[PDB]
Amino acid sequence: MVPISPIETVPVKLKPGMDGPKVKQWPLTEEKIKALVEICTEMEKEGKISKIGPENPYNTPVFAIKKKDSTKWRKLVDFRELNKRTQDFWEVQLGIPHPAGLKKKKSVTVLDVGDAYFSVPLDEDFRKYTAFTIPSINNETPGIRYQYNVLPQGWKGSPAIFQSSMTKILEPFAAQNPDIVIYQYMDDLYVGSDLEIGQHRTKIEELRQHLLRWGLTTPDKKHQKEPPFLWMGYELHPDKWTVQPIVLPEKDSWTVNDIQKLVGKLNWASQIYPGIKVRQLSKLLRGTKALTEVIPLTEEAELELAENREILKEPVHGVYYDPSKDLIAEIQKQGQGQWTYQIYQEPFKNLKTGKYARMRGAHTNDVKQLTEAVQKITTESIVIWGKTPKFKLPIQKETWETWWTEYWQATWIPEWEFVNTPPLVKLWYQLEKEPIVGAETFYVDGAANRETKLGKAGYVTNKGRQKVVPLTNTTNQKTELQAIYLALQDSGLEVNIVTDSQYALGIIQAQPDKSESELVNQIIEQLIKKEKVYLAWVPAHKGIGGNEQVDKLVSA
């Protein structure tokens, strides 16, 4: 006998204040019982479970299930209650590698370590909580009681403990063989390298010899799995990757559920198929969540879906990462708050693609959305490659300079260069810093009655120009914006506007180019047409001429 190293046990606890499960065993048919007795006798022979005495008070139910199109039964120990009572564990798999961050490999070998799983012992002190009972034939003897000695399939801690145990064993092998990579998924190890095939095979044999130190055997007859691998919704090949086939169904009509699934598929596709769009389809899901409801596609949604079908008409693949090269990210504006991007190292060879959508909110502008997209891409790139790409952006350097130097918030975008591919992102208007000599001065105000919702908006000017308009179904805030709109409408190309509206200032000082409010959009449209606008704020009700006059006219 050759001594083997034991696998270190992970100490396991129940949640604070919780005791183990005490769940009633269901009755079973005589046929099911005989089946479970046979199955458990074999598991016992294999060391997986041990018979226990009557003192243990815990229990978990066991079932017998018929393996479809077969005369063979399978056991199912239902650990749901134990799982609720078991502590939380560290879960290593939460963040999965993105294919675009992987490196090209010549060879990837798959080793089955499913048998190794049963050399990982369960913490002795915890075994008692895994007890289960096979009912006896005719209920005439005590049921046969067992507990587990190994990680039970279906128990909360098994995946984390199996993975951590394997990682600990594999660490030295990985550290001392830096020319390979090793990745565990389920019951398999994937071992990749760029070695000539003989050497790669030697490394695999050395890995098998290393694992034997813990008595872990792998199957001589080599795995059936070989590239390409279907993994986590992807296809991995030795020198390229893609998503598994994206098939958008034909339908005569679409329900909420159909559309949710469609957008899900498009979202998944967008990581390698450039230019995928989902705005108009996603708009259809607004507010409603009756999955069976039929939603008629708008003309806009039909167009979006047609454009996506064309994008998806044939396979697209990504390449893998070469750490010796820079990463480049290029972004395009698509319209309606949509943005698309590609990340590459060599021209025309994308590592991946993606998209960004405008955040929900009252007002926005293209420079802010571009900035947000840059941040999203930056963070994504740090995760996948550990570095920021150089950016190629559809905004002139002078536009960016004007924006950030004058914007009230701190803002930054990392190293980038202008790419002249329309539509370009621009600043649509720029307010004056100082009052305009020779331009007419408009004092604006609005007010509404909170009960009737009737109101008034208007202006008075230093030239004696005046206007008041009566309004219905309005509010103080809307009338304050309406007054500014009137002044813009009625003035020349250069204008000074004096308002007491803190609300209106808060909006305009945010520099929107688009708004959910039609009124704010009308104001933006006017600003775009002007040569010069100076917007001045004064406090209300303070005796300030001009302001005081118009306030009286609209509050009447």
Partner 1 sequence: IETVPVKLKPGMDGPKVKQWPLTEEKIKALVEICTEMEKEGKISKIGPENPYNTPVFAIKKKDSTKWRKLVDFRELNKRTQDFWEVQLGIPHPAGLKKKKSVTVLDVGDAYFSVPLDEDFRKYTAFTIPSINNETPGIRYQYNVLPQGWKGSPAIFQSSMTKILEPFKKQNPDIVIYQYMDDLYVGSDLEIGQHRTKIEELRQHLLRWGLTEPPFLWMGYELHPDKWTVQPIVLPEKDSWTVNDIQKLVGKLNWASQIYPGIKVRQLSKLLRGTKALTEVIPLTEEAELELAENREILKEPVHGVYYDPSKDLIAEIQKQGQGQWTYQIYQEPFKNLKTGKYARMRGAHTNDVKQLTEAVQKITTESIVIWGKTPKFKLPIQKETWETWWTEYWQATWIPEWEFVNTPPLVKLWYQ
Both tokens assigned to 455: 């109101």
89-96 long-range contacts, Cβ below 8 Å, gap at least 24? 89/156, 89/157, 89/160, 89/161, 90/160, 90/164, 91/159, 91/160, 92/160, 92/163, 92/164, 92/167, 93/159, 93/163, 95/383, 96/232
First to last CA, the chain: 103
- Minimum distance from residue 485 beta carbon to partner 1 (Å): 20
Is there binding between residue 136 and partner 1 (CB under 8 A)? Answer: no
Is there binding between residue 158 and partner 1 (CB under 8 A)? Answer: no
Task: Closer to partner 1 by CB, 384 or 487: give it.
Answer: 384
Binding site for ligand T27 (CB under 6 A): 97, 102-103, 105, 108, 181, 183, 185, 190, 192, 227-229, 231, 236-238
Binding to Mg ion (CB under 5 A) within 423-462 occurs at: 445
Q: Which does 460 bind (CB under 5 to 8 A by kind): partner 1, ligand T27, Mg ion, none?
A: partner 1
Binding site annotation covers 513? no
**Cα–Cα distance, 274 to 459 (Å, whole number):** 51
3-state helix, strand, coil in the chain (%, to 5): 35, 25, 45
Binding site annotation covers 187? yes
- Minimum distance from residue 205 beta carbon to ligand T27 (Å): 18
- Minimum distance from residue 403 beta carbon to partner 1 (Å): 11
Is there binding between residue 11 and partner 1 (CB under 8 A)? Answer: yes
Tell me, what DSSP letter sits at residue 492? Answer: -
Q: Which does 62 bind (CB under 5 to 8 A by kind): Mg ion, ligand T27, partner 1, none?
A: none
Among 119, 147, 149, 163, binds partner 1 (CB under 8 A): 163
Question: Do the bridges between strand 241-243 and strand 234-236 make them parallel or antiparallel, or are there none, so unpaired?
Answer: antiparallel
Among 117, 118, 185, 537, binds partner 1 (CB under 8 A): 537
3-state secondary structure of 501: coil
Binding site annotation covers 326? no
**DSSP assignment of 485-517:** HHHHHHS-SEEEEEE--HHHHHHHTT--SEESS
Both tokens assigned to 235: 């296809």
397 Cβ contact list (under 8 Å, min separation 6): 418
**What's the maximum distance between 2 C-alpha atoms anywhere in the chain?**
109
- Minimum distance from residue 540 beta carbon to Mg ion (Å): 5
Is there binding between residue 253 and partner 1 (CB under 8 A)? Answer: no
312 Cβ contact list (under 8 Å, min separation 6): 246, 248, 269, 273
Task: Closer to partner 1 by CB, 301 or 439: give it.
Answer: 439
Both tokens assigned to 544: 């300030």
518 Cβ contact list (under 8 Å, min separation 6): none
Is there binding between residue 498 and partner 1 (CB under 8 A)? Answer: yes
Q: Which does 236 bind (CB under 5 to 8 A by kind): partner 1, Mg ion, ligand T27, none?
A: ligand T27
Task: Closer to ligand T27 by CB, 242 or 338: give it.
Answer: 242
- Minimum distance from residue 86 beta carbon to ligand T27 (Å): 28
**Cα–Cα distance, 515 to 365 (Å, whole number):** 9
Binding site annotation covers 500? yes
- CB-CB contact of 173 with 22 (8 Å): no
Is there binding between residue 452 and partner 1 (CB under 8 A)? Answer: no
Please count the residues of this chain forming the interface with Mg ion, following the rule CB under 5 A.
Answer: 2
- Minimum distance from residue 275 beta carbon to ligand T27 (Å): 26
Q: 374-392 burial, b if ≥16 CB within 10 A, otherwise e? A: beebbebbeebbeebbebb
**Cα–Cα distance, 148 to 47 (Å, whole number):** 9
Among 76, 424, 469, 536, binds partner 1 (CB under 8 A): 536
For residue 65, list its beta bridge partners. Answer: 74
- Minimum distance from residue 483 beta carbon to partner 1 (Å): 15
User: How many residues appear in the chain?
Assistant: 556
Task: Closer to ligand T27 by CB, 9 or 184: give it.
Answer: 184
Please count the residues of this chain forming the interface with partner 1, following the rule CB under 8 A.
Answer: 76
Binding to partner 1 (CB under 8 A) within 382-401 occurs at: 382-388
Binding site annotation covers 480? yes
Is there binding between residue 546 and partner 1 (CB under 8 A)? Answer: yes
Among 436, 469, 519, 553, binds partner 1 (CB under 8 A): 436
Is there binding between residue 551 and Mg ion (CB under 5 A)? Answer: yes
Q: Which does 17 bind (CB under 5 to 8 A by kind): partner 1, ligand T27, Mg ion, none?
A: none
3-state secondary structure of 219: coil
Among 437, 450, 451, 472, binds partner 1 (CB under 8 A): 437
Q: Which does 363 bind (CB under 5 to 8 A by kind): Mg ion, ligand T27, partner 1, none?
A: none
3-state secondary structure of 115: coil
**Cα–Cα distance, 108 to 239 (Å, whole number):** 11
**Cα–Cα distance, 202 to 307 (Å, whole number):** 50
Is there binding between residue 513 and Mg ion (CB under 5 A)? Answer: no
For residue 144, list its beta bridge partners. Answer: 134
Q: Which does 415 bind (CB under 5 to 8 A by kind): ligand T27, partner 1, Mg ion, none?
A: none
Task: Closer to partner 1 by CB, 469 or 505: give it.
Answer: 505
- CB-CB contact of 470 with 499 (8 Å): no
Question: Which residue ranges make up the annotated binding site?
Answer: 112, 187-188, 445, 480, 500, 551
Interface residue list for Mg ion (CB under 5 A): 445, 551
Binding-site residue positions for Mg(2+): 112, 187-188, 445, 480, 500, 551
